[PDB]
Amino acid sequence: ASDAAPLQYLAPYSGCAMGEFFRDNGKHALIIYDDLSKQAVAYRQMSLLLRRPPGREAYPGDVFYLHSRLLERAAKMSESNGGGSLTALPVIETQAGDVSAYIPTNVISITDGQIFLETELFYKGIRPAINVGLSVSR
Amino acid sequence: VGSAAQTRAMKQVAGSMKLELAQYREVAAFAQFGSDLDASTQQLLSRGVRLTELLKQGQYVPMAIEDQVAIIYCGVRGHLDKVEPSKITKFEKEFSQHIKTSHRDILDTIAKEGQISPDTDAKLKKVVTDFLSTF
Amino acid sequence: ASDAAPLQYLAPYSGCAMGEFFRDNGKHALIIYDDLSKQAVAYRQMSLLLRRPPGREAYPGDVFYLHSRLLERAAKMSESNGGGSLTALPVIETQAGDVSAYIPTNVISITDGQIFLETELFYKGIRPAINVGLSVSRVGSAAQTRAMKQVAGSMKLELAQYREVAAFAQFGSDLDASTQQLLSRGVRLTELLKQGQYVPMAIEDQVAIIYCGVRGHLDKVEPSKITKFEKEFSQHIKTSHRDILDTIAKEGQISPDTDAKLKKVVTDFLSTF
Amino acid sequence: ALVYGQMNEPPGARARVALTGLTVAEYFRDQEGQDVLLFIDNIFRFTQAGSEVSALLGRIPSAVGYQPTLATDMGTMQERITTTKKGSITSVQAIYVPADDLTDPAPATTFAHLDATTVLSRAIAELGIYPAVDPLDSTSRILDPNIIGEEHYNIARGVQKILQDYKSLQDIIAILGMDELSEEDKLIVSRARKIQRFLSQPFQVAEVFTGHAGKLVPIKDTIKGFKMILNGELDHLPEVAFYMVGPIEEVVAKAEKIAESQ
Amino acid sequence: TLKAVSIRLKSVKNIQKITQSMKMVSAAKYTKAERELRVAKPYGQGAMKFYEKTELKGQLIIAISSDRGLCGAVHSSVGRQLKADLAANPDTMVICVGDKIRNILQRLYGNNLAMVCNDFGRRPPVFEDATKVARAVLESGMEFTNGKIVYNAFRSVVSFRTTDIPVFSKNAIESADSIAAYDSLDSDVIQSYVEYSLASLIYYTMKENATSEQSSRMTAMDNASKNAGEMIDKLTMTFNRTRQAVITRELIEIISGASAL
Amino acid sequence: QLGELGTGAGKGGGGGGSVRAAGGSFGRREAAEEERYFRQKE
Amino acid sequence: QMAFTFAAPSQVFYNNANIRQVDVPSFSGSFGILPAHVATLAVLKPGVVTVYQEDGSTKKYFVSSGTVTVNDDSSVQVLAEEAVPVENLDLQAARDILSKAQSDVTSAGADMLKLAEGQIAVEVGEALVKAAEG
């Protein structure tokens, strides 16, 4: 949080490149973006300081392409490409359990399913507080 | 514009309809939890339900002003209180046919007068009761 | 409103400097800004036309600084500075009760307490329509006399208890005796705070009438006759029992001996009343 | 030490005065090796001043009118408040929530840095319990059986569970009465009222306004005292003996003094 | 819009306050009523013991209700059971205690309504009201051989069952097969015992019905307050989202107008 | 279609308390019970 | 083995408790009950129901009206209108109501219904006089 917004914007792509080394060399890598909601805030700061037109919740229009070009690099390769893979676990923080907000709905439309964690289940002592009915694996 | 945009026959029957729909609006809410109602209130509720089903109309079939006035006049004078609302449309076609080829003198009388006289009101009510007996 | 926007923006600072003359010379001044909402509109007009960067609701970024540097000049000066004072009563008009709007949010943060007024309470007969549960005074009872602090502490506690059980009083008639007592007392105290316009009353009259409210002297009277009791019993103690008022003024409070004398006066008056 | 960035100051002064107080606290950490306390009041006015500065500089505001650099402005200040190898700075920050909305960008950015929470409730103060900390609404991240200890965590969870049962039984007592579940809920309500009284404590800085000498309870005395109340070892003492006394030895000494005076 | 959510949130908040106030009042009445039901239940057990021992099998129908409505599904389901009686005994006169049963059943079987008691429900049921109904059955002179009383049984706090307690006549009691085993039977003894057993069964149902009605109203307001509380929380989050969206959208419009110059 | 009483302030039919201003179905319930009482009186 | 169900609209006294003897004042004669009694039923009258449990304890319960039923399964169901122990009663109050009843009888005149009510209160008052003074 003390680092500049361009550093927080660049860091998911830097880690993805380090994970894409294992994917393209026949090995398998797991990557965790903790969290992409803060990277969208850092990118919104860069966009607003560049006088770009704000949209929904003052986010730029390419905040979907910000995460889509990142997460699409997590793929399972064919045997002619070495057979490696990259697995992505993006993290999104909601506000009062609102998965209908702009940024979480963008990432849900990108990823292959979401694991939803409930505040109500977390208060009751259920850990991990995974919502079974609202967790999808495509 | 109000009633100035209506003809004399329509203004006579739409004013009474607007009063009855206002009275029906006061008493239409009783179906939520009410069970026992006054006989005059039940008649107002039944007539207003007929009027709400009277305002329904299919697509691409606009009806003439004389047909609209005659059907609304029957709706607000209690001529449809004995008819189930599901058969209002069937009555709207068949009864209008009955007063078209047989009682066309009455239509000419209303057209020349421009309104509904009490004698013409009694004549139309007798045709309605005769048609409902045949219905 | 016919004056230019710079004149409407500059008027609170001009009046504050006039009140600061009394503050710096050892005297006490009261300044009313009626109202600061329109002064912020005038300052917004100048800033927008000077091509200054607009913010929330098109207000400039230094509109908090506009009202804070005005309202911080209301101070109670030290005894080495002459002991003068300047008291500010800013007025803010809110839109449909939205106290979270930008300009009301700023002035609420600056000031030392608020006096909320509602139109719903206004048409219920509560005039002045002060919301007791919402209005705050951060200085507390340090700004009250000994007699007023003695009685308003019990009145605040009783009115808080009445608002807790105010839901039952609307329909509940077969309640317990304690809840009926709490709602009946709060009705007397709510009717007690009603006051006409352009008729302020002295602190002795205010303390006496709310002493009768919180000591159960009004539980036997109807709420519609509370206002008539407020004026007539005040006359009954201003020209027939002046010795009790002298003792209260001499000691600054109500002793239990003076409490017993007031109880006998109320009982004798309510026999006549 | 006070730095006092006042309200009648320009937004640049109010935005930087949290950095001024942080600099004084950083000297006591780095150049003295101490555990420093930093009090920020108010942290919302730090955010508000930064929003005014960005509006003055002409930057396009972010959502709900805040500055585009809101997370970085908060993050740059809050990341200097940490434990280093020389010392630490612990920050207690007064928090204002605008429009009672916890999803507002100013509290939502602030809550990402908080490690605890101390809620001062006026309802607790109306019961005469001082300090008026709400025992259930006050949270902490380090309330886990790895940072504070197993006995600390279990006693804290038991105290919270007892007070939650008291809250769930208060309406039942208010409707029916004290006669419920024979002497099981009577034991729970007796312990819970003893817990609420034992949370109160006299303060040394207020010992001339109240007359009660202040107490500084060590952590082991607190854990031992609340373990005794949870185990029912003090069911024969009045609840008044648990009020405004620091250690649990003060409780039994006060109960003995009551028994001697009676 | 923001105004529509604010108006709706204010209304639901007032609904929760009323239902919470109703829940506290109805819980107080239910606590008092169940306290007296704890002693007035074996009173009905002893009264029904004689009719159980005779094993007599079945006109008149007693319906127990109250003028205080909106207590749940009490008067609706009891009237529904009464409607099933109208499909089973269409020629049976029914004596109702409460206007709600009269309102529901007058449209269907207004020709088979003997009398409807009103101005009842606000007061707790005591024996004098039971004797008023008992004297009403006697002095009316209406012919009846068998009969039953419709009331809401008190199964539990959240569950109430609509059952029937059979009530016979003096003439039917004399004609009973097992009544010959009971001795000291003459006209005056049977007549007085029957007209007091009736006033002991009516008192038993009135205590069961009152406790069941207060319990149903208590759990209905409890469900209403919880549901209004959940609706307040969702409307508060919707209000906060809409308030933030309005501020952001209005500022973007001002910025776009400022940048286009 | 007539703007039934209690459906909402400015939404065709309504006007009054918070429930009637909010409309929906509780405003319909308020209008139904009130009009039933005053029709019984008349 | 004699199940006792002595209840009242106000209070409840016994619930299936084994009692050696209960003597009941009924309209068919002020008879007594022992376990496995005669299958019968009778109507209570103003008088002193007595309870003699398995321990021989004597308890007096004055009632004002009611019903008494003994079934073939040795089950006793005595229901009374207002059953109270006689110790919380006053003989002076009993004669005061009795004198009031006598005034009602004398002032009844042609009011035969009021004459019956005076006679009824006379029976209740005389029952309580013997109850309280015994």
Short mmCIF file of C-alpha atoms in Angstrom, two decimals, chain C residues 2-271:
data_model
loop_
_atom_site.label_atom_id
_atom_site.label_comp_id
_atom_site.label_asym_id
_atom_site.label_seq_id
_atom_site.Cartn_x
_atom_site.Cartn_y
_atom_site.Cartn_z
CA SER C 2 -30.25 41.32 -5.25
CA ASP C 3 -26.72 41.98 -3.99
CA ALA C 4 -23.79 40.54 -5.90
CA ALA C 5 -22.28 37.17 -5.06
CA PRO C 6 -19.09 38.75 -3.57
CA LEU C 7 -21.25 40.80 -1.20
CA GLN C 8 -23.13 37.71 0.00
CA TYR C 9 -19.83 35.85 0.43
CA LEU C 10 -18.22 38.71 2.37
CA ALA C 11 -21.12 39.50 4.73
CA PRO C 12 -20.42 36.77 7.36
CA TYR C 13 -16.80 37.94 7.63
CA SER C 14 -17.89 41.56 7.92
CA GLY C 15 -20.38 40.76 10.67
CA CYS C 16 -17.85 38.54 12.45
CA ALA C 17 -15.35 41.40 12.56
CA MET C 18 -18.06 43.64 14.02
CA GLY C 19 -18.69 41.01 16.68
CA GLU C 20 -14.96 40.55 17.22
CA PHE C 21 -14.77 44.21 18.28
CA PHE C 22 -16.90 43.37 21.31
CA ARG C 23 -14.98 40.14 21.93
CA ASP C 24 -11.57 41.85 22.02
CA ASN C 25 -12.78 44.74 24.22
CA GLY C 26 -13.95 42.52 27.09
CA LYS C 27 -17.62 42.38 26.05
CA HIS C 28 -19.80 39.50 24.91
CA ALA C 29 -21.25 39.28 21.41
CA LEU C 30 -23.67 36.95 19.64
CA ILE C 31 -23.51 36.53 15.86
CA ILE C 32 -26.20 34.87 13.74
CA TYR C 33 -25.40 33.79 10.18
CA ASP C 34 -28.79 33.47 8.47
CA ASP C 35 -27.91 31.57 6.54
CA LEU C 36 -24.55 29.98 5.70
CA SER C 37 -26.08 27.81 2.96
CA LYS C 38 -26.63 30.81 0.70
CA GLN C 39 -23.15 32.18 1.42
CA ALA C 40 -21.64 28.92 0.16
CA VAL C 41 -23.78 29.18 -2.98
CA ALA C 42 -22.44 32.70 -3.57
CA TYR C 43 -18.86 31.50 -3.06
CA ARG C 44 -19.50 28.57 -5.41
CA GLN C 45 -20.73 31.00 -8.07
CA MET C 46 -17.53 33.05 -7.91
CA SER C 47 -15.29 29.98 -7.91
CA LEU C 48 -17.05 28.37 -10.88
CA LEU C 49 -16.85 31.64 -12.83
CA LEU C 50 -13.16 32.04 -11.95
CA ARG C 51 -12.60 28.60 -13.56
CA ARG C 52 -11.53 27.10 -10.24
CA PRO C 53 -11.75 23.28 -10.14
CA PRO C 54 -15.19 22.17 -8.95
CA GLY C 55 -15.72 19.39 -6.46
CA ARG C 56 -18.74 17.66 -4.95
CA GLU C 57 -21.99 19.46 -5.91
CA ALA C 58 -19.74 21.83 -7.94
CA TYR C 59 -18.45 23.41 -4.73
CA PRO C 60 -14.77 24.41 -4.62
CA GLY C 61 -12.30 22.42 -2.59
CA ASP C 62 -11.85 25.27 -0.08
CA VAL C 63 -15.50 25.65 0.90
CA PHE C 64 -14.88 23.78 4.16
CA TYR C 65 -12.00 26.21 4.68
CA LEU C 66 -14.44 29.04 3.91
CA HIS C 67 -16.77 28.13 6.78
CA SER C 68 -14.15 26.81 9.21
CA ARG C 69 -12.06 29.99 9.19
CA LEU C 70 -15.27 31.95 9.78
CA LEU C 71 -16.66 29.85 12.64
CA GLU C 72 -13.39 29.35 14.53
CA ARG C 73 -13.36 33.07 15.38
CA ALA C 74 -16.22 32.50 17.84
CA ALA C 75 -14.27 32.03 21.06
CA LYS C 76 -14.47 32.52 24.81
CA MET C 77 -11.43 34.65 25.53
CA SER C 78 -9.25 34.12 28.58
CA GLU C 79 -9.27 36.45 31.58
CA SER C 80 -5.84 37.77 30.56
CA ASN C 81 -7.38 38.63 27.17
CA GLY C 82 -10.23 40.64 28.70
CA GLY C 83 -12.65 37.78 29.27
CA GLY C 84 -14.84 38.63 26.29
CA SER C 85 -16.69 36.15 24.14
CA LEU C 86 -18.21 35.68 20.70
CA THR C 87 -21.07 33.21 20.25
CA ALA C 88 -21.99 31.97 16.78
CA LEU C 89 -25.40 30.66 15.70
CA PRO C 90 -24.97 29.59 12.07
CA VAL C 91 -28.09 28.61 10.16
CA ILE C 92 -28.03 25.81 7.58
CA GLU C 93 -31.05 24.99 5.43
CA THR C 94 -31.10 21.30 4.56
CA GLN C 95 -32.94 19.70 1.64
CA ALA C 96 -35.51 17.06 2.71
CA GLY C 97 -33.64 16.45 5.95
CA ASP C 98 -30.44 15.40 4.15
CA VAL C 99 -27.88 16.34 6.80
CA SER C 100 -25.33 14.24 4.88
CA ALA C 101 -25.25 16.79 2.06
CA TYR C 102 -21.90 18.44 1.43
CA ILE C 103 -22.40 21.88 3.01
CA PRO C 104 -24.39 20.63 6.06
CA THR C 105 -21.72 17.96 6.62
CA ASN C 106 -19.02 20.63 6.79
CA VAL C 107 -20.83 22.93 9.22
CA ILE C 108 -21.88 20.03 11.47
CA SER C 109 -18.21 19.04 11.73
CA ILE C 110 -17.09 22.60 12.51
CA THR C 111 -19.69 23.57 15.10
CA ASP C 112 -19.97 22.56 18.76
CA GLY C 113 -23.43 21.02 18.48
CA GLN C 114 -26.60 21.25 16.40
CA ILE C 115 -30.25 22.16 16.89
CA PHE C 116 -32.23 19.99 14.48
CA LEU C 117 -35.66 21.16 13.32
CA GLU C 118 -38.21 18.93 11.59
CA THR C 119 -41.38 19.74 9.67
CA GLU C 120 -43.00 16.55 10.98
CA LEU C 121 -42.59 17.78 14.56
CA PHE C 122 -43.57 21.28 13.44
CA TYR C 123 -47.09 20.27 12.38
CA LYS C 124 -47.62 17.98 15.39
CA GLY C 125 -47.81 21.13 17.52
CA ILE C 126 -44.21 20.86 18.77
CA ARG C 127 -43.09 24.47 18.32
CA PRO C 128 -40.12 25.05 18.46
CA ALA C 129 -39.72 21.82 16.48
CA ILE C 130 -36.46 20.74 18.10
CA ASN C 131 -35.61 17.05 17.78
CA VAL C 132 -34.30 16.23 21.26
CA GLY C 133 -32.80 12.91 20.19
CA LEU C 134 -30.85 14.48 17.32
CA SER C 135 -29.86 17.89 18.69
CA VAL C 136 -26.52 17.86 20.51
CA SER C 137 -24.61 20.39 22.60
CA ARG C 138 -20.98 19.33 23.00
CA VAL C 139 -20.38 21.79 25.86
CA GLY C 140 -23.05 19.89 27.80
CA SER C 141 -24.43 21.15 31.10
CA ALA C 142 -21.31 23.27 31.69
CA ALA C 143 -23.22 26.11 29.98
CA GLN C 144 -26.18 25.98 32.39
CA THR C 145 -26.90 27.53 35.76
CA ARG C 146 -27.01 25.37 38.88
CA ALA C 147 -30.82 25.42 39.01
CA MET C 148 -31.19 24.61 35.31
CA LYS C 149 -28.57 21.84 35.39
CA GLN C 150 -30.32 20.34 38.42
CA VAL C 151 -33.68 20.05 36.67
CA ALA C 152 -32.66 19.54 33.02
CA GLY C 153 -30.59 16.48 33.93
CA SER C 154 -33.68 14.71 35.21
CA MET C 155 -35.74 16.04 32.30
CA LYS C 156 -33.22 14.71 29.76
CA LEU C 157 -33.24 11.31 31.48
CA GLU C 158 -37.05 11.19 31.62
CA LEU C 159 -37.50 12.31 28.01
CA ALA C 160 -35.00 9.65 26.93
CA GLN C 161 -37.03 7.00 28.76
CA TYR C 162 -40.21 8.30 27.12
CA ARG C 163 -38.70 7.99 23.64
CA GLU C 164 -37.66 4.41 24.44
CA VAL C 165 -41.26 3.36 25.14
CA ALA C 166 -42.86 5.77 22.68
CA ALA C 167 -43.85 2.87 20.39
CA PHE C 168 -46.12 1.29 23.01
CA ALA C 169 -47.93 4.57 23.78
CA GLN C 170 -49.52 4.75 20.32
CA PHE C 171 -51.87 1.78 20.77
CA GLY C 172 -51.02 0.09 24.06
CA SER C 173 -53.62 0.92 26.69
CA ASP C 174 -53.43 -2.30 28.73
CA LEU C 175 -49.78 -1.89 29.66
CA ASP C 176 -48.05 -1.99 33.02
CA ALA C 177 -48.34 0.94 35.42
CA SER C 178 -44.67 1.89 35.02
CA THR C 179 -44.89 2.16 31.22
CA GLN C 180 -48.10 4.19 31.49
CA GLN C 181 -46.33 6.48 33.97
CA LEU C 182 -43.36 6.89 31.62
CA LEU C 183 -45.51 7.82 28.63
CA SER C 184 -47.75 10.13 30.67
CA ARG C 185 -44.71 11.94 32.08
CA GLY C 186 -43.15 12.31 28.64
CA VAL C 187 -46.37 13.78 27.27
CA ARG C 188 -46.31 16.41 30.02
CA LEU C 189 -42.65 17.22 29.32
CA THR C 190 -43.22 17.36 25.56
CA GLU C 191 -46.14 19.75 26.05
CA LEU C 192 -43.93 21.68 28.49
CA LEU C 193 -41.32 22.55 25.85
CA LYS C 194 -43.84 24.14 23.48
CA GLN C 195 -43.36 27.90 23.34
CA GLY C 196 -44.82 30.75 21.34
CA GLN C 197 -42.97 33.06 18.99
CA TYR C 198 -41.35 36.36 20.02
CA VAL C 199 -41.92 35.59 23.71
CA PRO C 200 -38.67 34.42 25.34
CA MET C 201 -38.84 33.79 29.07
CA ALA C 202 -36.38 34.34 31.91
CA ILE C 203 -34.32 31.49 33.32
CA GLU C 204 -36.28 31.56 36.59
CA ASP C 205 -39.54 31.01 34.70
CA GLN C 206 -38.04 28.19 32.62
CA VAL C 207 -36.56 26.38 35.63
CA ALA C 208 -39.78 26.70 37.64
CA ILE C 209 -42.05 25.35 34.90
CA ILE C 210 -39.82 22.35 34.16
CA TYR C 211 -39.35 21.75 37.88
CA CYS C 212 -43.11 21.24 38.07
CA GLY C 213 -42.86 18.96 35.04
CA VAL C 214 -40.23 16.59 36.42
CA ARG C 215 -41.56 16.53 40.00
CA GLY C 216 -44.94 15.10 39.03
CA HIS C 217 -46.82 18.35 39.62
CA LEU C 218 -48.38 18.07 36.13
CA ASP C 219 -49.42 14.41 36.24
CA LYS C 220 -52.85 15.39 37.59
CA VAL C 221 -53.50 18.06 34.94
CA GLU C 222 -54.51 17.64 31.33
CA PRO C 223 -51.86 18.35 28.66
CA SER C 224 -54.16 20.89 27.00
CA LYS C 225 -54.12 23.04 30.16
CA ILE C 226 -50.33 22.96 30.63
CA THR C 227 -49.83 26.28 28.83
CA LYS C 228 -52.48 27.96 30.99
CA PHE C 229 -50.79 26.46 34.04
CA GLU C 230 -47.45 27.80 32.78
CA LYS C 231 -48.59 31.44 32.83
CA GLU C 232 -51.09 31.46 35.70
CA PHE C 233 -48.93 29.57 38.21
CA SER C 234 -46.03 31.86 37.28
CA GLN C 235 -48.22 34.81 38.27
CA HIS C 236 -49.16 32.94 41.46
CA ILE C 237 -45.49 32.70 42.48
CA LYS C 238 -44.38 36.14 41.24
CA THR C 239 -46.66 38.25 43.45
CA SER C 240 -47.87 35.92 46.23
CA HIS C 241 -44.89 33.67 47.12
CA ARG C 242 -41.94 35.95 46.35
CA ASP C 243 -39.98 34.67 49.37
CA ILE C 244 -39.48 31.26 47.73
CA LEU C 245 -38.11 32.89 44.57
CA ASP C 246 -35.80 35.00 46.74
CA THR C 247 -34.37 31.89 48.43
CA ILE C 248 -33.84 30.14 45.08
CA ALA C 249 -32.11 33.23 43.66
CA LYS C 250 -30.00 33.65 46.81
CA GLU C 251 -28.83 30.03 46.94
CA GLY C 252 -28.83 29.29 43.20
CA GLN C 253 -30.61 25.94 43.58
CA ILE C 254 -33.68 24.30 45.13
CA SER C 255 -33.10 22.94 48.62
CA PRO C 256 -35.34 20.15 49.98
CA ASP C 257 -36.92 22.74 52.29
CA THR C 258 -37.71 24.96 49.31
CA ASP C 259 -38.80 21.80 47.48
CA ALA C 260 -41.38 21.12 50.19
CA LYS C 261 -42.59 24.73 50.07
CA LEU C 262 -43.03 24.50 46.29
CA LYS C 263 -44.97 21.24 46.74
CA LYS C 264 -47.41 22.96 49.11
CA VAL C 265 -47.78 25.92 46.73
CA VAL C 266 -48.53 23.61 43.78
CA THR C 267 -51.05 21.57 45.78
CA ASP C 268 -52.81 24.72 47.00
CA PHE C 269 -52.81 26.20 43.48
CA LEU C 270 -54.07 23.00 41.84
CA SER C 271 -56.91 22.97 44.36
#
